[PDB]
Every structure is written in C-alpha cells, then in structure tokens.
C-alpha cells in the first residue's frame, strides 16, 4: 500500500481554528509539513466530537489510515476516534474505532481493503477537549 498524494486531495472539517500560523486550518493535516497542524477552533472552544474529511480525488480500495500528532505540545492529540469512509461523498460508513493513547507517536489503522472516494476522522475525545493533526494519510 502507498500513501495517495495529499496534493490530489481536499481537506474540510466540522470546526477548524483559523490560520495564526501554522494552525489550524483542516488543510494543514495534509499539507506535508509535520509542524502544521489541523486544530478544532478554541477561540471560544467548539466542543467534540468534531471531524475532518478528505476527499480523496478519486475512487481507491484503501487498506491503511495514518494519524501523525503536532510534535511537542499534546492539545488536540486524539485518544477516542472513529474512521469512516463514503463512496459517495454523502453516506458514510464505520470502519474502525478505538482509543489512541495521549503520546505524538504516529497511529495507525490497518484495515480490510474498502472502496472509497472520501475518508472520515470522527475525534471523539482528544487532549484538552480539542482535536489536531500534523498530518494525515491514505494508503491505496
Ligand atoms: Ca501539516
Ligand atoms: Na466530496
């Protein structure tokens, strides 16, 4: 499996903060740049769950999601998620769920091959009520 190319993607969330350098749009998890994150807006705070999507720019038989925390700083790493994926841009369909310990290790899920044009990262619960990510990515 290999990582299909962020630049063919497209990344939104239900909450992003705005851009103060280096976070939080939801397009900074898939920029490839590990020290700029997707954070959930905290300016006030927008409770979770929130997600991101990212449209795929494609339709791929994915197998393998990585998460990569912010480095450093533990805000947002998340611990409780769920990963789903939609054929259609519309309905989406649970395919793995868990809990992540608090660490910026890079987590990984490996599942059954899917058909996807979409991918979705539910944050359930993560560090300090917010959700973030370095980088995102998408194994086909
Ligand atoms: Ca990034
Ligand atoms: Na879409």
């Known amino acids: 499996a290999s990582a299909l190319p962020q630049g063919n993607m497209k990344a939104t969330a239900t909450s992003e903060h705005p851009d103060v350098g280096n976070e939080g749009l939801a397009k900074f998890a898939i920029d490839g740049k590990e020290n700029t994150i997707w954070h959930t807006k905290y300016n006030p705070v927008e409770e979770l769950p929130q997600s991101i999507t990212l449209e ?29 994926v939609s054929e259609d841009g519309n309905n989406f369909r649970k395919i793995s769920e868990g809990n992540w310990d608090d660490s910026g290790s890079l987590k990984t899920l ?24 370095a980088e995102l990515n998408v194994f086909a």
């Open 110 to 133: 490996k599942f059954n091959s899917t058909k996807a044009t979409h991918v979705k990262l539910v944050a359930l619960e993560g560090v300090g009520g917010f959700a973030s990510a």
């Open 56 to 84: 795929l720019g494609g339709s791929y038989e994915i197998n393998k999601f990585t998460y990569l925390p912010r480095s450093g700083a533990k805000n947002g790493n998340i611990t409780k998620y769920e990963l789903h």
